[model samples]
Target: QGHCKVSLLDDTVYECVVEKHAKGQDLLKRVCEHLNLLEEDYFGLAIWDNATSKTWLDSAKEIKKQVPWNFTFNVKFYPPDPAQLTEDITRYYLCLQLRQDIVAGRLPCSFATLALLGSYTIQSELGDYDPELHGVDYVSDFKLAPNQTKELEEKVMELHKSYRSMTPAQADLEFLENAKKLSMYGVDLHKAKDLEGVDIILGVCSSGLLVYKDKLRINRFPWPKVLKISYKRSSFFIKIRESTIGFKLPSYRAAKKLWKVCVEHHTFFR
Candidate 1:
């Protein structure tokens, strides 16, 4: 079954105007900031550690034993029939609601569609399709405008071409390796800089791990820096020493105070 792709264009280039939309820009800014922090703090730290492997049991005896084995414990014997499966799958349909008062001259931005997609498309379509079966994935809550869908399809195809070149196992291994590295690096940095006080050091690692002993009113000395790496992306706002600094663009306050402290001490990077 198919549905209509909404249209969201006025008198300008779709790409240019799409970026100008408030919500679109916000999402882009957020994604960019996340990527920057991930690279500088998370990726940088991961370069030295293997914590990801240990935490996930990647190296655990049970998991390790299976590494060399090709095991398929479960299989669908009588999988749902393809022709009927589409209808059997549950889905939701929604219509976009306009603001109570929309100006006559204004047009909806691409982000409006993106927002909707984030809210609806996946549930309606992507949830049921399996990539392994070469079926189209449903995009929840999002309906691309006709022109936008055309452009997006081409872009997605290009991305798929690139992605398809790599083996799944290789990609999986790389992800695990990167996670382990970031986990090790970020956590270690936080631990080393616990007593230093808040500054830019936090940004250097991007994993917030600061100790606050509630029992003892003394929150200082032996400042515990316990880094907890996540399963997905890395965050670049770590608590180092007492100052927090990493990739958020050093502020005047951070620059001044951290410099003052630097005058009396030295730090070594491993």
Candidate 2:
């Protein structure tokens, strides 16, 4: 027997008692029970290393093999088509996930997108706009980025005015619709250096791979333009537009993980 702690996206901690003989789903089931979640496939419990690299649970694996079972329940996969979701609860959870994504700096976008999403989140959770209840500074309650600017709050309030007629699910749908259009929509990133040997990040998403340095985005290559991706030993390479770009990774293991996710996302979205 062992105790498992599952932290949720909503900033709540759930600790449960369980037997090590159980399957991966055993602990997940209890947490979903607490959530009353029926559409469980879109979610999973992920173990984050101290480095913040996420490793999702193997639902088919026996619990004993992966002990000390502390995990964070997060959205493992983003649906390419979110409007197709059958339940409003699923959409609601997606909104919450994206809300955290922006606040945590995992998903980056323009200030326009951030304000729009932040406004929708407020409308979805607080019902509608108000006078004395939700004043000019009311948007302060929610954190949409690493730092919130007063102008952003004003923009969020201004956009929120138009959403007065929207319902909770309606607000969430708008949130997802706008979020999906972002360049970084479904991006999973790995740190690397460019051909110039400048430090950069490589992002893999629904469309293709993007190269960025610092907070400024340099360029992106769409999937259709790419030939293939290959990793050899501690080196990772991508062939796009018949041009080959090479990068050195920290280790062969990280190189393989990047290669694996690229292949996985290409098939699922492409």
Candidate 3:
């Protein structure tokens, strides 16, 4: 038998003893039982390789081979708040996470797999396909993956044909519907408070700023709405075309970094 210390997302620690042949899933089940978590699939243990790199412990792998006699494993939870899964926008966040993972190679998938996923995303954004109206070249426009397969390509086209007349936002939600089913459907979310002292989360994307509270989007300032951006001390300011807005961030560094994002977004998009 060996001893292991499991650290939860909230920094709570639990020590447990397990047999040498225990699997990662076994350890995870034990941790979930200790915490009274009903949804065990939403959480996993991540083992750090060194100070900077880490990998999620494969639940199918033998824990004894993965860890030493005395080990510490971090509990990683995705969607931070599982209750948020009830919302469609929360699922949209999962889509963003999937895109990031695919682009960063964190979720390794074949080109056909990537294209199939992209087809879903496009179906969400563009709507149902029409061969007579929408050109075949449309699929090639999206640079989602590398090589292609005739079977997967035809499958994507067929799926696209079914999404006819969907609005962009509706299409996005549709894409998210499928993305949320993936194993790595988690986002490394950062939390902060807005000017009104309400707890909020800021997510930066190619479009603009997304402000979320309790998994719902409270505010969104696209690049076009943003006119001027600046920061001072621990506060950041955004000058829209007709009005100005400000937010109190956790630190001056945070404020400046957010301002920098605004500037970059403006430069790239505007």
Candidate 4:
């Protein structure tokens, strides 16, 4: 048997024992049990393929082959409708996941929306603004956006002022509400190029492939519409209807990563 460390959404580590040749699902199940996460379908153990990029662990695959494994437990798919989720604990974990995306600049939003969501975060984290408890410039403690600005801080505090004495759970729900409105709410971006040799970005999530132009989501190729996803020579293809939309990738490794993620998402959500 081997021991592995799994990092949770809140940056906490979980150490588990792995039996030789055990299915990856075994470890995932143990981790979920440890956290008392009943809705484990929404979360997955993600293994870093290298220093930066990560891929989801294959639940049925043997763990012995993937030794010395270190995993991060992350939300694999965001329910298109969060109302289906009943547990406040589940929602809390998701809140942290979305918070990470926004703060990491992966999920971009308008300054107004950012401030609004940031205020909810502040309220949830430290409760409603209290001058006596929170000294001047308390907002600086939270990194709501990658590019934190002076103007944005004022905006967050200004909006947060009105949120009076809301419980942490209430603030979190409000935060999720405001966050779900974002176009790229659950979409993870990959920089790609179009057939015209112009730069374009792709959004991968439970909804299938999202095509963007000028930061505006121009098109969405739903999961069922995607008949096939394949790549060759840094070129990716998405077969839909009678036509195929192709995009250029920078490297083969990235193309594989994109294809695998899309397939995983497709099977999980479909």
What's the candidate order when arranged by decreasing TM-score?
4, 2, 3, 1
lDDT of 3 by residue, 88-207 (tens): 543444455465456655445665566668777667545677667777656655444444455556667776776656675566565555555553344333356776798877655445
Using alpha carbons, what is the TM-score of model 2? 0.77
Per-residue CA lDDT of model 1 for 1-270, tens digit only, reads 011111111111111121221332232233234333221110110011232111111111232221211111111111112121222211010011111001111122244433333222222223333467544443312433433454454443333433433343333232223222322222211211233333222212122222323211222222234222111122233344565433221344333323322221212111
Q: Candidate 4, overall lDDT?
A: 0.83
Using TM-score as the measure, name the better of candidate 2 and candidate 3: 2
Q: Which candidate, 1 or 3, would have the higher lDDT against the true structure? A: 3
Reference-based lDDT, residue 181, model 3: 58
Worst 10 residues of 1 by lDDT: 92-101
On the 0 to 100 scale, the lDDT of residue 186 in model 3 is 43
Q: What lDDT score goes with residue 256 in model 3? A: 65
Tens-digit lDDT string for candidate 4 (1-270): 568899898888999787766788899889988998878788888777665566677788787665466888988888776655888777788889898888877788889888988898889888878878776588987888989998999999888877886998898888888777777788877788998998888889878899888788888999988888888878888898789899998898668668877887788888
Residues 62-112, candidate 2, lDDT per residue (tens digit)? 776654568888776688678988999898888888877787688887898
What is candidate 1's CA lDDT for residue 125?
29
Checking candidate 3 for backbone clashes, the offending pairs are 124-171, 124-172, 125-171, 127-163, 127-166, 128-163, 128-164, 128-165
